[PDB]
Design a protein around this ligand. Structure first.
Ligand SMILES: CN(C)c1ncnc2nc[nH]c12
Ligand SMILES: CN(C)c1ncnc2nc[nH]c12
Lengths: 208, 208
């Protein structure tokens, strides 16, 4: 069933910094997420070039944005490469120990938080707006897994079976109470237009 | 007693755009109001090199920011050139030397509300965050006056005797009920250091 792991101490730290530093520009989290999703989609397109079959698990390459106001969650969904259990656990297949260190080191010298994505660590900006993040992922070489954390220094990984999702990754944001603006359709289009306007993949925003 | 005026049509339209356009990046109002005070100050500093009895109503050339959570107001005070009765009506109530027209056409052709200062009408960015605005002002050549407007197409002007200020202008923003972040010390410092760090007069954030 559920394994719990500790974050490496540096990811714990950075996670803490994002949760606790006063920084009004919280919206940059979306860009960061949209920008992990594109990269993920680049990787599967890349691999399929030489191996057509990698798209048996789905030929469609795209990003959906799914707000749900009852659940108070904003789900960012791609049909990219996905993550094996190992990737999930490996920070997130991100180079996070070094990326974090450099990053905090750049934050000494006049970097502000929005540059997070420059360090391979954009993903953790989800915590600018989210109290808990669930990540569902399917990679072609592996089962479907749910990773999850409310920060606090730990994560869980369990296998996930309720709806097979084909191939790719769902990052579910359970929003903090004072951050429900990011479920508003005009708030979300405004963001995508302002930070993600030209991106190599179709972005669909679901309606309620 | 109290005189009531109509905004010149275009200004009425523009104030309507500021109030009604969906636009999340409201924090720039502070930048525009500060930069307005600084032009005021430049002016009195300039005028006073050829006539120094003009500083007779106050030598300090500074900007104050006074939040007040009871009244729900943020007030920007400068000890600048002030306005006469006439300057209030023309400068606040009519196109005057502003690029109102070019600003409104610009937003038609892709520009955005943050670029408002580029057109000399950035004072109306007050209406991003305020439901009502009162300007108390005092020029070396005139009485002290209160101008006021909750938009809806008109403004008032009366003499203001409760409270002589020497020389300059206070802009008091009665903040919308959901715009009270701009009363927070931490929020105010963030904004000034982001948009106003190079202003060339002391900017004092008063404490509550
Ligand atoms: C951040 N990260 C490690 C990711 N890896 C693979 N697919 C993803 N889709 C969103 N984020 C993804
Ligand atoms: C808006 N406007 C025309 C202004 N005129 C003179 N002094 C000012 N201080 C802040 N705004 C001012």
């Amino acid at each position: 069933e559920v394994e719990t792991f500790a974050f490496q101490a540096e990811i714990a730290q950075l996670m803490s910094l994002i949760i606790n530093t006063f920084y009004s520009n919280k919206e940059i989290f979306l860009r960061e997420l949209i920008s992990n999703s594109s990269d993920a989609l680049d990787k599967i397109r890349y691999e399929s070039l030489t191996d057509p079959s990698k798209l048996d698990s789905g030929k469609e390459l795209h990003i959906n944005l799914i707000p749900n106001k009852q659940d108070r969650t904003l789900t960012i969904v791609d049909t990219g490469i996905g993550m094996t259990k190992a990737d999930l656990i490996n920070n997130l297949g991100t180079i996070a120990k070094s990326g974090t260190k450099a990053f905090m080191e750049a934050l000494q010298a006049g970097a502000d938080i929005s540059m997070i994505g420059q360090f391979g660590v954009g993903f953790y900006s989800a915590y600018l707006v989210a109290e808990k993040v669930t990540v569902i992922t399917k990679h072609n070489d592996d089962e479907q897994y749910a990773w999850e954390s409310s920060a606090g220094g730990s994560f869980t990984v369990r296998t996930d079976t309720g709806e097979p999702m084909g191939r790719g990754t769902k990052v579910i944001l359970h929003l903090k109470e004072d951050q429900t603006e990011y479920l508003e359709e005009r708030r979300i289009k405004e963001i995508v237009k302002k930070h993600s306007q030209f991106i190599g993949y179709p972005i669909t925003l679901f309606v309620e």
